[PDB]
PDB file of C-alpha atoms (C1' of nucleotides) in Angstrom:
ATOM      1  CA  UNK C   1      71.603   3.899 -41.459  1.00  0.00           C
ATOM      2  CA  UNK C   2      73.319   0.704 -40.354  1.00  0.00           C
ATOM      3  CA  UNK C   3      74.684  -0.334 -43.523  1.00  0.00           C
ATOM      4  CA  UNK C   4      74.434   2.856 -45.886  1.00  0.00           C
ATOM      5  CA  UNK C   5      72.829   1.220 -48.891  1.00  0.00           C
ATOM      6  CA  UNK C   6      70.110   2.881 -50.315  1.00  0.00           C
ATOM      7  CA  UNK C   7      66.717   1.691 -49.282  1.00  0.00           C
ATOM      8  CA  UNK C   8      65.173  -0.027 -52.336  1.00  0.00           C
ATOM      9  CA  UNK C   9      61.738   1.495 -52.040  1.00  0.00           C
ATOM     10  CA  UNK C  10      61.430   5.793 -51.780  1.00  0.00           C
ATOM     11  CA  UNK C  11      60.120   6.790 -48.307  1.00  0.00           C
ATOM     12  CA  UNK C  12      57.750   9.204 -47.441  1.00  0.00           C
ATOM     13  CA  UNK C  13      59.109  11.861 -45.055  1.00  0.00           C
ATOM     14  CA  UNK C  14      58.293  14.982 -44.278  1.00  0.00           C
ATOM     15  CA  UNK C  15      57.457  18.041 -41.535  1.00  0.00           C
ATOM     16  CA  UNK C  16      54.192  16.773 -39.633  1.00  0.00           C
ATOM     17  CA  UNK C  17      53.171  17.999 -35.939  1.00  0.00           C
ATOM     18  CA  UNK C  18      52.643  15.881 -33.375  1.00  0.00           C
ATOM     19  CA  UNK C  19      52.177  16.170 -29.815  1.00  0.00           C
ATOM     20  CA  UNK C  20      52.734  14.280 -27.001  1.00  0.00           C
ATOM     21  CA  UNK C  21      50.592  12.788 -24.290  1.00  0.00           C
ATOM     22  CA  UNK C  22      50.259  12.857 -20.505  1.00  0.00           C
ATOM     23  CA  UNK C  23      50.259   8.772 -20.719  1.00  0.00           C
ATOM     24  CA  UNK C  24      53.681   8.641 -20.365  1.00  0.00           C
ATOM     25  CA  UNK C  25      55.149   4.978 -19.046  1.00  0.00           C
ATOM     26  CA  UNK C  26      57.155   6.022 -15.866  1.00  0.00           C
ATOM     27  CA  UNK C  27      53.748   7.190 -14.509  1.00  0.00           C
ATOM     28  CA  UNK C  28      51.977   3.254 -15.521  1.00  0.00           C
ATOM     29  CA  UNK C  29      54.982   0.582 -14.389  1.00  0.00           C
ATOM     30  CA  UNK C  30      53.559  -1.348 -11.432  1.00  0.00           C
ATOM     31  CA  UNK C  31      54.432  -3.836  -9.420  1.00  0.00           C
ATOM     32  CA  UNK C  32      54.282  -5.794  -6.345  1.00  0.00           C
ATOM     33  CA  UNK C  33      55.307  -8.713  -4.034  1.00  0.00           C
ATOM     34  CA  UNK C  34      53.696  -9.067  -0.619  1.00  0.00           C
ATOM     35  CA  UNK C  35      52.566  -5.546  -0.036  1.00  0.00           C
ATOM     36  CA  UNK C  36      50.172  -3.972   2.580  1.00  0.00           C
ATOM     37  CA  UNK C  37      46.697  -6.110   2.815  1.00  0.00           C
ATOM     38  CA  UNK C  38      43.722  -4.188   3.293  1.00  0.00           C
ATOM     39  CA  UNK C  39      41.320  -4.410   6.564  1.00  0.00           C
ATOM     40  CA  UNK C  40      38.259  -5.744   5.894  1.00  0.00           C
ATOM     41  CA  UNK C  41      39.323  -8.313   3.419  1.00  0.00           C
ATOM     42  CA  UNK C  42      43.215  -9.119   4.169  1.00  0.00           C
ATOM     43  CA  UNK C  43      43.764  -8.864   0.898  1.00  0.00           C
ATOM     44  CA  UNK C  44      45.937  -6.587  -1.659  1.00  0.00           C
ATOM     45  CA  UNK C  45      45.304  -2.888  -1.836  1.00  0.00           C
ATOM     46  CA  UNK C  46      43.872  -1.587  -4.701  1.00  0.00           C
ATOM     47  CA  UNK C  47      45.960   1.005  -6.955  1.00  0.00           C
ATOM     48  CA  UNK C  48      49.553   1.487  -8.227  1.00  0.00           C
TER      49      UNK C  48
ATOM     50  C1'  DC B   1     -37.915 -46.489 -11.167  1.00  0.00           C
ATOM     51  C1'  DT B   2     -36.529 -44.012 -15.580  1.00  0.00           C
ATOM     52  C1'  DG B   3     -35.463 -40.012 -18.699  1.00  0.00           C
ATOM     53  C1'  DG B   4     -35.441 -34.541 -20.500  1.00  0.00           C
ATOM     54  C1'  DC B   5     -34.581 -29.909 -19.097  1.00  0.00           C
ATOM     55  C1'  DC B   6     -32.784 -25.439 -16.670  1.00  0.00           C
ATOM     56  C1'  DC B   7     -30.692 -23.834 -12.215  1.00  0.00           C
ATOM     57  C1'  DT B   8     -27.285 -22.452  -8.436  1.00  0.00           C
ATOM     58  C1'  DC B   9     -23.032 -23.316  -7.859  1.00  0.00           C
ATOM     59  C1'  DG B  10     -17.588 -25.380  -8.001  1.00  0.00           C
ATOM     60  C1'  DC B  11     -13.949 -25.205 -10.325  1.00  0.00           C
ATOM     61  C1'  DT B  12     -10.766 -24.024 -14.101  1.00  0.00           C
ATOM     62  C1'  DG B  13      -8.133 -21.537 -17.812  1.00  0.00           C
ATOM     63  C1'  DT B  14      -6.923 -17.376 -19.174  1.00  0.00           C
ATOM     64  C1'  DC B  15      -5.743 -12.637 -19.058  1.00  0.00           C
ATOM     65  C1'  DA B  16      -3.796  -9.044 -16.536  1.00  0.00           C
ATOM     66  C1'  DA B  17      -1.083  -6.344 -13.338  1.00  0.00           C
ATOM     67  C1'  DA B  18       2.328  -5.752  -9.628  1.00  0.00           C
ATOM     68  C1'  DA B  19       6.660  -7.103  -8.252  1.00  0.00           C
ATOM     69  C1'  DT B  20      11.534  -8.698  -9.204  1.00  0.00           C
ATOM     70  C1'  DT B  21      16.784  -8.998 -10.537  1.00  0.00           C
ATOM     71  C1'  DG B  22      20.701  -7.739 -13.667  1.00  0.00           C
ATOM     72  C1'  DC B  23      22.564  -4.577 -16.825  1.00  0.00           C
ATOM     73  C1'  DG B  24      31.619  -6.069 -19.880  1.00  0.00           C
ATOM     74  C1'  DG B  25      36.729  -6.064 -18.109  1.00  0.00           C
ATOM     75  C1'  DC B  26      40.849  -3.988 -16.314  1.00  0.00           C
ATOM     76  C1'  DT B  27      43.407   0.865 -15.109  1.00  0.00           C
ATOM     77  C1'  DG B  28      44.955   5.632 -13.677  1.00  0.00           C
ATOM     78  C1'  DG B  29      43.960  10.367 -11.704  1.00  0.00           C
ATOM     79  C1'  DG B  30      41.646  14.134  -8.659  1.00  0.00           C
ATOM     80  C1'  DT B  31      38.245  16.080  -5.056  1.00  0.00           C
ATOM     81  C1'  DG B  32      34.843  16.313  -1.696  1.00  0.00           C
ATOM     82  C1'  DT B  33      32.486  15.056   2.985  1.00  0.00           C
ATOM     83  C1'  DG B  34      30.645  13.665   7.577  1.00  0.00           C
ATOM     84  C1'  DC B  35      14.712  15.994  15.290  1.00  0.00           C
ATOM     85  C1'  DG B  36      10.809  19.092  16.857  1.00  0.00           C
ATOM     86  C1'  DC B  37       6.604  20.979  19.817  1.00  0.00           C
ATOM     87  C1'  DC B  38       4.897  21.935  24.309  1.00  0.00           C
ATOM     88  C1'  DC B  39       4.853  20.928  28.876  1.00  0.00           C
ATOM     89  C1'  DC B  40       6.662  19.883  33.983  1.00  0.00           C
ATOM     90  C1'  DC B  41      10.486  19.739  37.442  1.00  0.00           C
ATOM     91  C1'  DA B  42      15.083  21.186  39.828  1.00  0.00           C
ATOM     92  C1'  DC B  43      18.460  24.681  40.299  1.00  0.00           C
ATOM     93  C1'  DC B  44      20.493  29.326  39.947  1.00  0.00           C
ATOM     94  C1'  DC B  45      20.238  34.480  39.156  1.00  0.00           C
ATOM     95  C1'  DC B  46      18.368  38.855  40.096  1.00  0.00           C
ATOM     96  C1'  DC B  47      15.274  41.674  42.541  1.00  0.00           C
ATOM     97  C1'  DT B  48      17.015  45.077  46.922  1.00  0.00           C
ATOM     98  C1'  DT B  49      20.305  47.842  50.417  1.00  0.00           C
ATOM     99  C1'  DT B  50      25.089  49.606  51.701  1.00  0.00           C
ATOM    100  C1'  DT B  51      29.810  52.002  50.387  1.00  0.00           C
ATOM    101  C1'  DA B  52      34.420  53.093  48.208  1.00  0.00           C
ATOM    102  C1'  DT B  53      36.621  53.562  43.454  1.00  0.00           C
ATOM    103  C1'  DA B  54      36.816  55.713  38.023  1.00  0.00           C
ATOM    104  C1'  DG B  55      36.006  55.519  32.945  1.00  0.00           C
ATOM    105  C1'  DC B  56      32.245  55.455  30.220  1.00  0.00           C
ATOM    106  C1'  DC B  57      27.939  56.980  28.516  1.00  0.00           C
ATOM    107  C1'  DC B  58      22.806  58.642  28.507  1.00  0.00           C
ATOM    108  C1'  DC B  59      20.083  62.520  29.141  1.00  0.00           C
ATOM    109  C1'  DC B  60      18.920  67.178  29.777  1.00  0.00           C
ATOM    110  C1'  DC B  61      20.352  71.779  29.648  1.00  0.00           C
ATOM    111  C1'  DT B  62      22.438  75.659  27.562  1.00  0.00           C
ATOM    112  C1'  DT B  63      24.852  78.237  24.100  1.00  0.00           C
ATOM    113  C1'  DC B  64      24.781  80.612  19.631  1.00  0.00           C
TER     114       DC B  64
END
DNA sequence: CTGGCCCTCGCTGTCAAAATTGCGGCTGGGTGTGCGCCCCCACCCCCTTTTATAGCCCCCCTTC
């Protein structure tokens, strides 16, 4: 595609079904600086 | 005093059973949930009477 030569080696490509999964990133990132502390131990909470 | 033998008994090794602690690391969801009997002692309610009031309802009587 970026160049428009012909790839060298023959490619397989064809119609094949896939499907895609709940696991999806935006519901994964995480992060944290100096959150809420929990009671017992004063320390981080547990869970995105 | 010295030596040979079998005995109750003291102690030990050995086997066995009961008792004991841990069983990977992170993560993300959601969804639920929070005595007991029988007796004894204080306190209060209903038993009863009165009367007005009226809607409601049981009971007995009467009809056909």
């Amino acid at each position: 595609g970026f160049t428009g030569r012909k790839i060298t080696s023959q490619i397989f490509i064809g119609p094949t079904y896939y499907q895609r999964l709940k696991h999806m990133v935006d519901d994964k990132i995480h992060s944290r600086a100096r959150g809420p502390i929990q009671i017992l131990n004063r320390q981080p909470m547990e869970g995105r």
